[PDB]
Write a structure and sequence with these properties.
By secondary structure, the protein is of the alpha/beta class. It is built from eleven helices and twelve strands. It folds into two domains: 173 residues, no CATH class; 123 residues, N-(1-d-carboxylethyl)-l-norvaline Dehydrogenase, domain 2 (Orthogonal Bundle). Helix 7 runs antiparallel to helix 8. The PDB classes it as oxidoreductase.
């Protein structure tokens, strides 16, 4: 019944604002008591829509106290997901369901294995949101979220509550195919944007590099049972480049801001998966090696 929100991701606050303002029970799970004290001083969660700011006084708490968690939304970086879910594992009720809003792959399976008695649903979202302060989030762009569970493919009954809160979603009976579509899309664009220090539109000047990457990424999708994604991957990459030509990729923004990237769940996960299939991916291998060396050169982690 209650929507417990864990993680400091921008999407978690956007979900919490829409869920709470629609009359659904929502409870924020903040990091520590110091963070809870500052949230109470701010008075609630501030959402910015088209320049207009609104204050949503959602109830909040810390992982140690509170009621049993039956439904948890995990919205954090992929490298923080396992550590975050384990901080509230003592409050999971057995019938608990987890909605994992992490980019890439790897962290979802790690959380699912760490919490065997809980149901971990996978999510892939295109909604844009960024933080402008400790408890202030800007609704940057409308998007769509795909939900699914590889272990239990039947849709839950609470999906209609998301419709009431205006959260666009679709239940997919093969959520792994959706996550692989977006991961292969990330590997073809973001690594080159960091190495070349350019906007996504600048990748038009490297057509053969894009084609060779999608070639190996297409073989990786074919070897994993995702034929439809592999055939349209190249034109899908071309469409995203033209649609986001003036934008800097999310990984380009992470590096320029001196922060850790999610490479361990994007290009690093792809090359890892190709090795397990015995599928050689040399171009992605050197691309991964150049990206890791690029990160280490600036004191940033390479995983």
């Amino acid at each position: 019944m209650t929507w417990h929100i864990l993680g400091a991701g921008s999407l978690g606050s956007l979900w919490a604002a829409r869920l709470g303002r629609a009359g659904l029970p929502v409870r924020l799970i903040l990091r520590d008591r110091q963070r809870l004290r500052r949230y109470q001083q701010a008075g609630g969660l501030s959402l910015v829509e088209d320049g207009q700011a609104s204050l949503y006084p959602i109830a909040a708490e810390t992982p140690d106290g509170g009621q049993p968690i039956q439904r948890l939304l995990l919205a954090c970086k992929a490298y923080d997901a396992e550590e975050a879910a384990s901080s509230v594992a003592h409050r999971l009720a057995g019938n608990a369901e987890l909605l994992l809003l992490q980019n890439g792959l790897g962290s979802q399976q790690a959380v699912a294995a760490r919490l065997p008695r809980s149901r971990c649903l996978f999510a892939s979202s295109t909604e844009g949101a960024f933080r402008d302060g400790d408890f202030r989030v800007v609704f940057a762009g409308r998007g769509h979220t795909w939900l699914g569970d590889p272990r239990d493919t039947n849709a839950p009954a609470w999906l209609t509550q998301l419709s009431q809160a205006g959260i666009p979603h679709s239940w997919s009976d093969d959520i792994l195919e959706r996550l692989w579509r977006k991961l292969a899309l990330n590997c073809a664009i973001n690594p080159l944007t960091v190495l070349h220090d350019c906007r996504n539109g600048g990748l038009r000047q490297h057509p053969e590099e894009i084609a060779a990457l999608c070639d190996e990424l297409g073989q990786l999708l074919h070897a994993s049972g995702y034929d439809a994604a592999a055939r349209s991957l190249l034109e899908d990459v071309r469409a995203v480049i033209d649609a986001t030509a003036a934008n800097y990729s999310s990984m380009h923004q992470d590096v320029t801001r001196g922060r850790r990237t999610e490479i361990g769940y994007l290009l690093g996960y792809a090359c890892q998966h190709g090795q397990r299939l015995g599928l050689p991916l040399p171009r992605l291998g050197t691309l991964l090696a150049r990206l890791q060396a690029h990160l280490r050169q600036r004191g940033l982690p390479d995983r």
